[PDB]
Amino acid sequence: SLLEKVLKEWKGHKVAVSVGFTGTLEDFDEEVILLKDVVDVIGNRGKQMLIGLEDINWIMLL
Amino acid sequence: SLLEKVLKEWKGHKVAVSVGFTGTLEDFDEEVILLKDVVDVIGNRGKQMLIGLEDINWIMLL
Amino acid sequence: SLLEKVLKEWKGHKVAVSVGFTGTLEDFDEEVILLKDVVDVIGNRGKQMLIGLEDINWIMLL
Amino acid sequence: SLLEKVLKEWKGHKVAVSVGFTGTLEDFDEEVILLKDVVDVIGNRGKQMLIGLEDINWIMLL
Amino acid sequence: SLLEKVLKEWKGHKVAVSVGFTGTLEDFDEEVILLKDVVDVIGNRGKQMLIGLEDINWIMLL
Amino acid sequence: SLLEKVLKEWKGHKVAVSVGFTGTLEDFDEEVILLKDVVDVIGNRGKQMLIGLEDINWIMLL
Amino acid sequence: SLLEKVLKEWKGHKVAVSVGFTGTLEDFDEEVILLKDVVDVIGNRGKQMLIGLEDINWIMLL
Amino acid sequence: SLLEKVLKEWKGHKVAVSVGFTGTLEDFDEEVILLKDVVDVIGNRGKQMLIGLEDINWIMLL
Amino acid sequence: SLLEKVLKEWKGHKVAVSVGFTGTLEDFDEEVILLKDVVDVIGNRGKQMLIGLEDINWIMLL
Amino acid sequence: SLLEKVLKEWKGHKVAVSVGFTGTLEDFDEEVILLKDVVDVIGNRGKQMLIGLEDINWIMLL
Amino acid sequence: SLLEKVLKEWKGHKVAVSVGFTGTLEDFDEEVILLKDVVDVIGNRGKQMLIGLEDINWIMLL
Amino acid sequence: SLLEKVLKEWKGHKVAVSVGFTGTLEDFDEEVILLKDVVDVIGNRGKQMLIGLEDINWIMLL
Amino acid sequence: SLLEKVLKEWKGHKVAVSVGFTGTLEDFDEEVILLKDVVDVIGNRGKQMLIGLEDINWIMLL
Amino acid sequence: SLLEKVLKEWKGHKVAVSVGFTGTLEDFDEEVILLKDVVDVIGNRGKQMLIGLEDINWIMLL
Amino acid sequence: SLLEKVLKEWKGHKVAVSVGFTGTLEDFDEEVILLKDVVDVIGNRGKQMLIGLEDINWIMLL
Amino acid sequence: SLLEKVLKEWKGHKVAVSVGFTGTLEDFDEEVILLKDVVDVIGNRGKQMLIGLEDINWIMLL
Secondary structure, eight states: OHHHHHHHHHTTSEEEEEEOOEEEEEEEOSSEEEEEEEEOSSSEEEEEEEEESTTEEEEEEO | OHHHHHHHHHTTSEEEEEEOOEEEEEEEOSSEEEEEEEEOSSSEEEEEEEEEGGGEEEEEEO | OHHHHHHHHHTTSEEEEEEOOEEEEEEEOSSEEEEEEEEETTEEEEEEEEEEGGGEEEEEEO | OHHHHHHHHHTTSEEEEEEOOEEEEEEEOSSEEEEEEEEOSSSEEEEEEEEEGGGEEEEEEO | OHHHHHHHHHTTSEEEEEEOOEEEEEEEOSSEEEEEEEEOSSSEEEEEEEEESTTEEEEEEO | OHHHHHHHHHTTSEEEEEEOOEEEEEEEOSSEEEEEEEEOSSSEEEEEEEEEGGGEEEEEEO | OHHHHHHHHHTTSEEEEEEOOEEEEEEEOSSEEEEEEEEOSSSEEEEEEEEESTTEEEEEEO | OHHHHHHHHHTTSEEEEEEOOEEEEEEEOSSEEEEEEEEETTEEEEEEEEEEGGGEEEEEEO | OHHHHHHHHHTTSEEEEEEOOEEEEEEEOSSEEEEEEEEOSSSEEEEEEEEEGGGEEEEEEO | OHHHHHHHHHTTSEEEEEEOOEEEEEEEOSSEEEEEEEEOSSSEEEEEEEEEGGGEEEEEEO | OHHHHHHHHHTTSEEEEEEOOEEEEEEEOSSEEEEEEEEOSSSEEEEEEEEEGGGEEEEEEO | OHHHHHHHHHTTSEEEEEEOOEEEEEEEOSSEEEEEEEEETTEEEEEEEEEEGGGEEEEEEO | OHHHHHHHHHTTSEEEEEEOOEEEEEEEOSSEEEEEEEEETTEEEEEEEEEEGGGEEEEEEO | OHHHHHHHHHTTSEEEEEEOOEEEEEEEOSSEEEEEEEEOSSSEEEEEEEEESTTEEEEEEO | OHHHHHHHHHTTSEEEEEEOOEEEEEEEOSSEEEEEEEEOSSSEEEEEEEEEGGGEEEEEEO | OHHHHHHHHHTTSEEEEEEOOEEEEEEEOSSEEEEEEEEOSSSEEEEEEEEEGGGEEEEEEO
16 A cells, blocks of 8 residues: 555654644554654643544644 | 554553543453543543444543 | 443443433443433433434443 | 333333434334324424434433 | 335325425335425425435424 | 614515514514514414514515 | 513513523513523423523514 | 615616525615515515615625 | 436426525436526526436425 | 522522533622532532623523 | 725726625725626626625735 | 436536536546636636545536 | 632632633733643643633633 | 734735735735735735735734 | 546646645555645645545645 | 733743644734744744734643
8 A cells, every 4th residue: 555655654753643633653554543752732742642544634744 | 453452551541532531541342442530621520431432533641 | 342241330320421411321232222310410301211322422430 | 122122111102302302102113213292392393203213312201 | 114104194294304394295215205385484495396315304294 | 764664564464584484573663573473384383473683684575 | 662562461471482491481671581480392491590682582472 | 875876776676685585676775675576596485575784795786 | 216207207397406506407317417507596507517316405396 | 680689589599500510509790600519410510610691691590 | 094095906907805706896985895797606696796894804806 | 327428528618516616627437527727716726626526516517 | 899709719729711721720800810730631731821701601610 | 003013024024814815915004904926825816915904813924 | 547547647746635735746546645745825734745535525736 | 911911921931822823922912912933733834923812712831
């Protein structure tokens, strides 16, 4: 998948995501992605974060 | 599933969840997750909470 | 099902439900839940209530 | 079917419905329910009313 | 079907319909209903009207 | 006042109103209008009705 | 005021109100109205109720 | 007023109005406009219509 | 299909349609319908118009 | 003010309020009201609560 | 007023406008502006158009 | 398909499309349509445009 | 002001505020309130916070 | 005014604006600002543009 | 696939997308498209961007 | 002015704003505030930013 290909490459890099938040992309598979070091514009938000691809509009590398 | 793997690791830890609240990820499976000691900002909300995964935006380990 | 198991456990007890109200979880199954003695922030609402699992956000035990 | 079982016992009695109205439950099956002598807060609403269960949030025995 | 049964009986009678209008129910099948003499509160609207059951919330006999 | 002048002549006659309902125009002044024998598409709506002109979009002689 | 005139006359009578509920109109002045015996379609709601004229769309006598 | 002048000019003529319909600009003033013989994409709507200038978006001459 | 039957009869006649405009039902099939001489209230809108049935609320013969 | 008069009488009694919660009307004046022992359906929400009148839809004595 | 100055210069030229359409800025004053040869994307919409400034987001010289 | 047939017919010609713009129907198939030389009420928008049939309301020929 | 008096009383203490967050009411006046050590259901949010009384729904003391 | 001061300085520079678009700020006064060379992400939009300060959320220098 | 065929030829060129952003089309397949050097009206938006075709309204060659 | 007093002390420090964005507080007065080196979650947003206090919900020292 172009999606597998790219997400492999993006693994390690800070990314922004639209669900309907930013942080480093720790891992992913066909149903979810997982983020480390998650921040909002005001501060840190959580060690990790799970998000399903179903509810994801776009992902963007920083 | 990265989902299974991660939730296993998160089991016991305080987590926040988005549907459309925070507590301890007591337990889970494919269809639902179960929170313990669910609080809101104002205070406690209730001894436990079931939540369907189909309506979960994102879960986040604090 | 974590859902069957926990619901078995909560039968008898007061619970809050968000659909899209609180009362005693009288009974349930794969499709619906039956509440008994239903209250609202203003007062009584009904001897009973049927609710489909499909349109429930979360059920919470008090 | 908890739903069937429960709907049997409510037949004859005044009930309330959230769809997306109150009146006596004439009949029901899998697809729809039929309400007799439907009423609004403001007054009557007409001899009968069909309602498909798909768009029903909850029903409630008064 | 309770729905077939009733709509047969309601055929001939003025009815109101919620799609997401009133007039006499001329005919129906599993996918549509057809109305004659359609009025709004301000006046007549159209000799006939087709409406699919998919987009119909409730039907009500007058 | 075109508004006064015109409302005089419509007094007695069935009218329609958009507020944010149809029935006979009993009376009016600067602040409100009074409608008699108010009607809905679905049926009657009650002996009378006050309506403040501020929230009225248009009125219409039928 | 046509509004004073009518509300005097309507005093005693059950009325419906649109704010943005029904019951008997116990009293009113230029800023508020007060209702006794307030009901919704499901049941009683409260001995009394205050409502400011600012947020009232229409009032209707039953 | 460019508004008075142009309205004087358009009296007699068909016009469309957006509030928040089309018909002949029968008359007008500082507060309202009176339309005569009012039509909708489906047909007639009313012998006449009153509309306040406050809630009109644009008036257009055809 | 009552739908097929009726649309056949309506073919040639001016019709109004709701999606989310009026003209002559030129032709149709299962997936779409085709309008000719499509006008709006303000005027003509265009020589023809295709419209998918899946997004049609109601069609109405004028 | 009927408002002053009534709120005086209601002072001490449990009341529900709409802004956009229930408790004891502890005290009030022109600009605000103060609730004591404010609960929601799920439980207690907080020792006290101020609320501006400008944003109050309706208050209701239970 | 920069507004007066600019609109003077724009008088005669094709302009687009946002309220909540494009044509020639025929004329204007404090309360309103007047467009000539108002077209939309699909075609012509009407000989002229008045528009109140209070409801204008932005005007733009093409 | 009435859709294939009519689209074959409209290839070459200017058309308006509502999604959820106007230009020449350059080409199309079962899934998408390709527009060439795309215009908006304010001006040009693009050398070309791809659009999925799924999210089109109506296509109209000018 | 019931508002001044009660705010004097609550200075020092944790409070929840709804605007359109919780923290210590550090200080206040006729126009605004200053919060210190601000928390959200997920965690810290800021050393401090300013908020205008105009856009506050309710302030509540915990 | 801090607002006069800054807008003087920003005159000449490309800016973005939120009304409820970007280009160079040609001039301004207490009621409006005027933009030259206005672009959207897709292309140019208009030689100039007027926008009233009333409907402007923020302005931002680039 | 008109979609495939057309996307090939646009590869390398700056494009615009409506999702629910502009930049060079790096690659694509059935499930997603990849945009390089993504840009906002206000400025850059980050090295790359994945977008799933499901939530794409239209794409547009500039 | 608590507002003035407090804004003085925050000048120089990174702050967050809800309007209807974060960056260093350059200056302020009654009508507006000026933010320097404005930032988004996704990245920079431009040298400076004016914001009128009217549409500001809260400001927050980080």
